[PDB]
Design an enzyme around this catalytic site. Structure first.
Site, PDB file in Angstrom:
ATOM      1  N   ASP A   1       1.042  -1.104  -0.128  1.00 36.61           N
ATOM      2  CA  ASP A   1      -0.035   0.095   0.320  1.00 36.61           C
ATOM      3  C   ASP A   1       0.476   1.267  -0.032  1.00 36.61           C
ATOM      4  O   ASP A   1       1.477   1.403   1.272  1.00 36.61           O
ATOM      5  CB  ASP A   1      -1.019  -0.128   0.776  1.00 36.61           C
ATOM      6  CG  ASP A   1      -2.420   1.377   0.592  1.00 36.61           C
ATOM      7  OD1 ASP A   1      -1.815   2.022  -0.027  1.00 36.61           O
ATOM      8  OD2 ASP A   1      -3.101   1.226   1.277  1.00 36.61           O
ATOM      9  N   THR A   2       0.825   1.678  -1.106  1.00 37.62           N
ATOM     10  CA  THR A   2       1.674   3.316  -0.880  1.00 37.62           C
ATOM     11  C   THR A   2       0.522   4.597  -0.702  1.00 37.62           C
ATOM     12  O   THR A   2       0.881   5.758  -1.451  1.00 37.62           O
ATOM     13  CB  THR A   2       1.758   2.890  -2.599  1.00 37.62           C
ATOM     14  OG1 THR A   2       0.616   3.517  -3.316  1.00 37.62           O
ATOM     15  CG2 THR A   2       2.267   2.023  -3.417  1.00 37.62           C
ATOM     16  N   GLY A   3       0.025   4.206  -0.092  1.00 35.91           N
ATOM     17  CA  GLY A   3      -1.021   5.665   0.345  1.00 35.91           C
ATOM     18  C   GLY A   3      -1.752   5.351   1.792  1.00 35.91           C
ATOM     19  O   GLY A   3      -1.741   5.498   2.348  1.00 35.91           O
TER      20      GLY A   3
END
Lengths: 99, 99
Positions: B25-27
Site C-alpha cells: 500500500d503506497t497510500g
C-alpha cells in the site's frame, strides 16, 4: 516518471482543465476526488471512512490526465479530504511496483 | 519482484516464523497487521476506519520479511481486516513506483 516512497506519493492531475494533486494509491480500488463540477452524467454511489457512510457521485468515462499521461475511466466525486488515485487508473497508466 | 496493478497488490509476509499476506500500500503511512502475539514491548496507539477510533498495539523494531526481502522497522497490531504494508516498509525494501 518513476517515484520513490520515502514520503507520500503525490503527483499533479488534470480533470477538465483544472490542475490538481493526488495520491498514487496502490491500496485503493476506486478513484475519488475533490468536489469539482463535471460536465457529464452521474450515478449516486457511496463510500466511507471514519464515521463511514458518506454519499459520493460517480462519473463514468472521465479522461484524467496524470503526470503527463492521458487516461480515461471512472472517477468518483464527493466530500473527500484527498484526491486518491485507485487501482483503476494506475492500472491504465501502465503503472507497476518495483522492488 | 516487480508487480502490476491489474488486481490488488497482495504478497506474502513473515512476522516471526508466521507466513502471512498483505497489501503493498503506497497510500498508507503506518504498517498494521493481524492480531498475532509478538515477543516484544508495546506502546498503545490508535487508528480508525468506518466508525473510526479502534485501539491498536504498536511494536517497535520488528523484523518483517516481505517477498524475500528482510526488513525491520515498526509494525502495528490490532483488530484489522487486512494486513497492510505502509510507506515505512516499502520505503525500506527499496520499493519504487514506475510508470
Amino acid at each position: 516518471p518513476q517515484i520513490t516512497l520515502w514520503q507520500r506519493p503525490l503527483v499533479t492531475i488534470k480533470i477538465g482543465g483544472q490542475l490538481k494533486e493526488a495520491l498514487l494509491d496502490t491500496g485503493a480500488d476506486d478513484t475519488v476526488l475533490e468536489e469539482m463540477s463535471l460536465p457529464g452524467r452521474w450515478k449516486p454511489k457511496m463510500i466511507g471512512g471514519i464515521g463511514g457512510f458518506i454519499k459520493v457521485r460517480q462519473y463514468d468515462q472521465i479522461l484524467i490526465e496524470i503526470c503527463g499521461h492521458k487516461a480515461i475511466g471512472t472517477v468518483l466525486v464527493g466530500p473527500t479530504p484527498v484526491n486518491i488515485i485507485g487501482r483503476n487508473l494506475l492500472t491504465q497508466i501502465g503503472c507497476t511496483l518495483n522492488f
